[PDB]
Amino acid sequence: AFVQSGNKPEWMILTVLPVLPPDLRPLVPLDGGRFATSDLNDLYRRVINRNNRLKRLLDLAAPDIIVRNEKRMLQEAVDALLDNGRRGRAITGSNKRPLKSLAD
DNA sequence: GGGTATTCGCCGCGTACCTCTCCTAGCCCGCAAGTATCCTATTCCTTGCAGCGGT
């Protein structure tokens, strides 16, 4: 199947992650001076926080344990973004309800 | 190895509509307000030095 098609095997390992446009995930105001949940942006901010953390720690040459832990956390963040729940434990913001990953 | 049994984990479970409510938690730093305190006067008394009539 691989050789028949034009897909290299290693493309199953993500190196660059696309982001959904903004308007398809609009930030609806609640008119109480605040904003609603809009959890997709929450997952995106989470993964970006992990990414920047790892970027800094890689720049500053920390001991391998720290970078390994942070890369594990980043892997979990991407897992949450692409499909939340298929891993051992889902993540929630409140109400003990899982958020809506793209696959959901 | 190999045919078999047993277990684990994922997938699925009706349509359309109406009413209501509620939507992150915790720290922190500027900041308004309210206050107790400190310096500011007046009246009495007893000193210490510079002018000053007087001779």
Query: What is the end-to-end Cα distance of chain A in Å, rounded?
Result: 28
Say if residues A77 and A47 touch (Cβ distance below 8 Å): yes
Residue A30's nearest nucleotide, by CA–C1', is: B23
The whole-angstrom separation of Cα A73 and Cα A59 is: 18
Å: A80 CA to B4 C1': 40
Mark the nucleotides of strand B covered by protein, meaning any atom under 7 Å from a CB.
10-11, 23-25
In three-state secondary structure terms, A88 is coil
* Cα-Cα-Cα-Cα dihedral sign, residues A39, A103, A83, A18: negative
Å: A3 CA to B41 C1': 104
Residue A34's nearest nucleotide, by CA–C1', is: B23
Å: A89 CA to B17 C1': 36
Q: Residue A79, by phi and psi: left (phi above 0), alpha (psi -120 to 50) or beta? A: alpha
Query: A33-52 as b/e, with b when 16 or more CB fall inside 10 Å?
Result: eeeeeebbebbbebbeebee
- The experimental technique used to determine this model is cryo-EM
The whole-angstrom separation of Cα A53 and Cα A47 is: 10
The whole-angstrom separation of Cα A42 and Cα A65 is: 27
